[PDB]
Amino acid sequence: SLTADQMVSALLDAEPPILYSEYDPTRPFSMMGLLTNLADRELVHMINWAKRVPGFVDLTLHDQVHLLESAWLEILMIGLVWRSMEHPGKLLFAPNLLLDRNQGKEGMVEIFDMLLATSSRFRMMNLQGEEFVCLKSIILLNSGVYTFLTLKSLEEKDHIHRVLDKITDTLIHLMAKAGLTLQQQHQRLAQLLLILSHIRHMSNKGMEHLYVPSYDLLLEMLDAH
Amino acid sequence: SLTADQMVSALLDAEPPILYSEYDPTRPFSMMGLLTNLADRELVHMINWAKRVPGFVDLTLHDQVHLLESAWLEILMIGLVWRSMEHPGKLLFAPNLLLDRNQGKEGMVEIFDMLLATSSRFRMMNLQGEEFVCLKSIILLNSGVYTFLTLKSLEEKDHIHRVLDKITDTLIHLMAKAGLTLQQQHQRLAQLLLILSHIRHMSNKGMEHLYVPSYDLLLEMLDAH
Numbered sequence A, B: 001s002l003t004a005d006q007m008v009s010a011l012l013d014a015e016p017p018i019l020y021s022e023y024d025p026t027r028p029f030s031m032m033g034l035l036t037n038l039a040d041r042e043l044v045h046m047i048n049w050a051k052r053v054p055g056f057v058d059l060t061l062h063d064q065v066h067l068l069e070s071a072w073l074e075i076l077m078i079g080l081v082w083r084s085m086e087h088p089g090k091l092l093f094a095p096n097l098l099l100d101r102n103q104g105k106e107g108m109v110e111i112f113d114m115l116l117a118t119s120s121r122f123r124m125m126n127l128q129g130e131e132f133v134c135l136k137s138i139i140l141l142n143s144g145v146y147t148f149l150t151l152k153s154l155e156e157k158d159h160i161h162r163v164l165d166k167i168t169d170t171l172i173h174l175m176a177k178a179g180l181t182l183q184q185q186h187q188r189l190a191q192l193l194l195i196l197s198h199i200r201h202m203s204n205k206g207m208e209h210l211y212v213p214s215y216d217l218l219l220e221m222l223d224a225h
């Protein structure tokens, strides 16, 4: 029941920290080990973030876990692409781990190139931080909403779509706040949401190039006392 | 440079025919063979359709092929989900091939269930035929736009986004024509586009469950005299 500006403030405040890779800087420069360790540590902070997305903790624990299980790689990937926006040609996995295309060379450079093209698309659109946090919330709420297994589940899915509608309202409020015409507002909303299809694509490719946090582990981190 | 109503008319006129499965009806009821034969025959009509999507033939042949190669399974899948909308619990692969969940039983029922849930989502939204043809055009133009390999390619990608923006305008015109408020218009536009992320998901799962028309075959059907 919050306002658009309140939605944005809460989302901005909820942002996870930017973690560092744990490689010893004084030692020679093991890549996938570093990327898995980073992803492992970000997951914990991504659970704290998800619980702060307005409306998320109103869901059942089982539904929170399902949404996180479907979305976690997309959320890591959109965060990467956002961090990398102002580093053309490179991916800022961490402030001490900025890699270019050649450092990603089996099947890794393909996904690398996809992430770079997304970061470039974000650059050309001049994606704003307020828009980014809205998009990341949309991913959390949307990526698992069509794969649920009851009266309660109907209530849950209705709640999810009401929260999504509120983020849509917030995105349009941001573009209206900045002077875009009503035509430009619809167009940018559509351009931003179609990028989410590409992030899903890269997530599936990445899930494939990784063959992952278990349901039980997600539930254990989400089932707090 | 057409109007919204002209856009819709052209898209509706371009719709491919609904093909039949070639199984002999007088003989006992071979499933994947029937589904592959159907998909094979629909591809030819999907090329004719793509050339009628306003703006598509303005692209280079190489770019048309790339867009079709990335999108073809999503286009078959959204067509299926649209045909199946008014057959809850079943998938209308063809008018003589309406199958339920049990007939899809390795790894086939998973995708089956995903298609059914999309068809149900379309049902609940009361997706209109004018909206469907717009969405199918968006898929054609969007699914391969972030995976292109020049000054010409910059021109192509700018053209693609202008055509996408025009379909966004058309979708909003349809919802405004029907009396939705400006708030409801943005919300439904967003709901429709987020379903496209799920169609991409199912396409990747299906590409996986199929491991496909070659670049050369697509080029041969698209490179007409």
Ligand SMILES: CCCN1CC[C@@H](COc2ccc([C@@H]3c4ccc(O)cc4CC4(CC4)N3C(=O)c3ccccc3)cc2)C1
Pocket: A032, A035, A036, A038, A039, A040, A042, A076, A077, A079, A080, A093, A104, A107, A108, A109, A111, A112, A206, A209, A210, A212, A213, A214, A217
């Ligand atoms: C018990 C839990 C099971 N584990 C818990 C970790 C889990 C391993 O998944 C992993 C492993 C690696 C990653 C990184 C990573 C790290 C941080 C980031 O912010 C973003 C990313 C993005 C990313 C997805 C492309 N990546 C890669 O390496 C990559 C690969 C090929 C091409 C380019 C990049 C992400 C997730 C399985």
Ligand SMILES: CCCN1CC[C@@H](COc2ccc([C@@H]3c4ccc(O)cc4CC4(CC4)N3C(=O)c3ccccc3)cc2)C1
Pocket: B032, B035, B036, B038, B039, B040, B042, B076, B077, B079, B080, B093, B104, B107, B108, B109, B111, B112, B206, B209, B210, B212, B213, B214, B217
């Ligand atoms: C030289 C060219 C190479 N070939 C040219 C054909 C190409 C085979 O790909 C195929 C094979 C089958 C299909 C169908 C099909 C048919 C018609 C339709 O309208 C829609 C669909 C959807 C669909 C995607 C889920 N499907 C399945 O079976 C299915 C599988 C598991 C669960 C549920 C459904 C689609 C494409 C490879």
